[PDB]
């Protein structure tokens, strides 16, 4: 809705001021309501102006000229807002044409460790703020966990590949700046069982509904029943799902017991009636004989002999009336027994097939979180849900590497340079690095500040790949330990011809056991060339890294032949298998919220380190060691956009420290 849509696209509320804005504009937020609305409009309009054309720099001069009365009345207010938005990277980020070239004299010196999206985004900002920036990258390429396979005409992503909707996504801006061939992914995903036959529509919808019900139940367990600690240990999502499933199996058995208990009570009610009837039939038999004996005493009789005939007649008919009132009650209980035998409860909660299809949905969840469900925090695994972008998910058909390559332009990047040691004191910083091709060749880099974008997997390493001098404080290292770093792998299969449904982007393979549920469970058809991409998720990812490419591709072909036919599936021209946990420069795929951890650990990851004074009694020194990366952004973890935003945050923080605020 114009200016309101600009705030939404920048992840800001249109009608109120944020915590960051309150810090930079305390006079406004504590002041009258009218001035706040003036601030909010200037903010929203400036954002709209940038968002309308993100290919060119938006200056203060261009901003003020396009503002109307009475908003362009206060010129220093407009300047304060513009500077704030520029400094925090909400406007003028990414690849844009600079209207007046950057000042020749550079102020301050920053070393950035790592040339992924977080590193590159921070580097661009710091350079455009007028700082001396050098990036040190261990790999022979930029991009990091954005890694695109390219051989001949085949293009496929081994790392990041999906833009998770454009509504509120900073990657929407980047896509208007860099030629990303964004193609919408169609949601339709048919599942094929181990035999190779598709799951019927009725069963498929039943299992999926039960899956979401099971997930909703674990949330109920967490929030309402407070089932978060068990045996002095934090409860995992996997644990909670087991508990819910077990209680559903219990209810199936409890309702079976209650049903067959209604049968025995009816049978025993019938048993008491049948005994009563057998005893009365014998009394009726005896009294009939007594009647006919008295009746065979032929007339004329005295009145006592007549009474004997008449009284035995009354007594017999009364017992026959009593028998008839039990005979239809027998019928009432036999039909009650008929309907109970015809209407039993459920035999099982889930069959063997139902459990297997459910294990696919669990594997799909294990893909998303890049980790087995027994490692995820029950309370906090989905803490970033409210920050989900709107719109369809999109493939980067051009190959995602086009983004970091474009961000790399005009930057001083030292490739094949592995950081070994980070030194930080009150005077400044030393970064000690080696050449990866020749490890004896040593490099020393001196700087005012260090920005660490090393993956969480690298920071977790014992023994360490990178040493910090002095050692990182306990609050930092404990957060590094608590936090989860997951794993996920991809198998790229390049063919000469399309043998699959071209209008179907996604199809699933249902595994035989729970143990192998994530093993080649999902297939992607996304690219212009005939390429199929298979995922290895959950417990399978770590195990499948110890298996050779030929065997993995063999298992891929066996699954596809089951679905499409042996004659229909040719041998692939090119194959690639990712091994992200084994990769020394990643040591996994992306962060997750582990059991025992929370969203607060992401904030602790983001917090800069301040060294002690050199001389004792010297004033409190400034922060020297800064952190960015997907593992440092609470609201957008484990993504490209989150990495991007973490870089923009840190550049703004470093510039505030070393160039002064505003």
């Amino acid at each position: 809705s114009g200016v309101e849509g600009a705030a939404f696209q920048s992840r800001l509320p249109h009608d109120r001021m944020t915590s960051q804005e309150a810090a930079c504009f305390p006079d406004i937020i504590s002041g009258p309501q009218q001035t706040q609305k003036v601030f909010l409009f200037i903010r929203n309009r400036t954002l709209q102006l940038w968002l309308d054309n993100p290919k060119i720099q938006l200056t203060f001069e261009a901003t003020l000229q396009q503002l109307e009365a009475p908003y362009n009345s206060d010129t220093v207010l407009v300047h304060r807002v513009h500077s704030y938005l520029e400094r925090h990277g909400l406007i003028n980020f990414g690849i844009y044409k600079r209207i007046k070239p950057l000042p020749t004299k550079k102020t301050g010196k920053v070393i950035i460790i790592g040339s992924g999206v977080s590193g590159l985004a921070a580097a661009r900002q710091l350079q455009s703020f007028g700082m001396d920036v050098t990036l040190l990258e261990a790999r022979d390429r930029v991009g990091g966990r954005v890694a695109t396979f390219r051989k001949g005409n085949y293009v496929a992503d081994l790392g990041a590949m999906v833009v998770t909707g454009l509504g509120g996504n900073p990657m929407a801006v980047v896509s208007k700046q860099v030629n990303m061939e964004l193609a919408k992914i169609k949601q339709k995903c048919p599942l094929y069982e181990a035999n190779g036959q598709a799951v019927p529509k009725e069963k498929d919808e039943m299992v999926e509904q039960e899956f979401n019900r099971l997930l909703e139940a674990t949330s109920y367990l967490s929030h309402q029943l407070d089932f978060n600690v068990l045996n002095n240990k934090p409860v995992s999502l996997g644990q909670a799902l087991e508990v819910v499933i077990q209680l559903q199996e219990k209810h199936v058995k409890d309702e079976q017991i209650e049903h067959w208990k209604k049968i025995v009570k009816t049978q025993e009610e019938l048993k008491e009636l049948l005994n009563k009837m057998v005893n009365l039939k014998e009394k009726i038999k005896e009294l009939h004989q007594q009647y006919k004996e008295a009746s065979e005493v032929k007339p004329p009789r005295d009145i006592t002999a007549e009474f004997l005939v008449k009284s035995k007649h009354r007594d017999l008919t009364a017992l026959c009336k009593e028998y008839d009132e039990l005979a239809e009650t027998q019928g009432k209980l036999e039909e009650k027994l008929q309907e109970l035998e015809a209407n039993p409860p459920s035999d099982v909660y889930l069959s063997s097939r139902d459990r297997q299809i459910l294990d696919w949905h669990f594997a799909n969840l294990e893909f998303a979180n890049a980790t087995p469900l027994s490692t995820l925090s029950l309370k906090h695994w989905d803490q970033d849900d409210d920050f989900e972008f709107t719109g369809s998910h999109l493939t980067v058909r051009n190959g995602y590497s086009c983004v970091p390559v474009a961000l790399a332009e005009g930057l001083d990047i030292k490739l094949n340079t592995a950081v070994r040691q980070v030194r930080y004191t009150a005077s400044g910083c030393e970064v000690i690095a080696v050449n990866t091709r020749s490890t004896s060749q040593t490099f020393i880099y001196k700087c005012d500040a260090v920005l660490c974008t090393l993956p969480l997997g690298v920071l977790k390493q014992q023994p360490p790949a990178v040493q910090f001098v002095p050692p990182l404080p306990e609050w930092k290292t404990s957060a590094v330990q608590r936090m989860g770093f997951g794993n996920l792998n991809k198998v790229v299969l390049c063919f000469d011809r399309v043998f699959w449904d071209p209008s179907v982007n996604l199809f699933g393979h249902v595994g035989s056991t729970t143990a192998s549920r994530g093993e080649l469970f999902l297939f992607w058809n996304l690219y212009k060339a005939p390429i199929l991409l298979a995922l290895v998720a959950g417990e399978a990812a770590g195990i499948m890294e110890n298996i050779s490419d030929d065997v993995i591709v063999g298992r891929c072909l066996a699954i596809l032949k089951g679905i499409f036919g042996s004659s229909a599936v040719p041998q692939p021209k090119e194959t690639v298998v990712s091994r992200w946990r084994a990769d020394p420069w990643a040591r996994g795929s992306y962060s997750y919220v582990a059991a025992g951890s929370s969203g607060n650990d992401y904030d602790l990851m983001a917090q800069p380190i301040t060294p002690g004074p050199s001389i004792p009694g010297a004033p409190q020194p400034i922060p020297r060691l800064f952190f960015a990366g997907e593992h440092t952004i609470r609201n957008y973890p484990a993504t490209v956009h989150g990495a991007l935003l973490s870089g923009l945050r840190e550049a703004g923080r470093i510039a505030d420290q070393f160039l002064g605020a505003m």
Binding site: V162, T164, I185, Q187, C189, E208, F211, N212, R213, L214, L215, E216, A217, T218, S219, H361, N364, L365, F367, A368, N369, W381, D382, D384, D385, F387, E388, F389, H393, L506, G508, L522, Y590, Y592, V593, P637, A638, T639
Partner: peptide
């Protein structure tokens, strides 16, 4: 994280 589910997006517990 959960927002990355392109295929069969989970709904339970949001």
């Amino acid at each position: 994280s959960r927002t990355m589910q392109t295929a069969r997006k989970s709904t339970g517990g949001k």
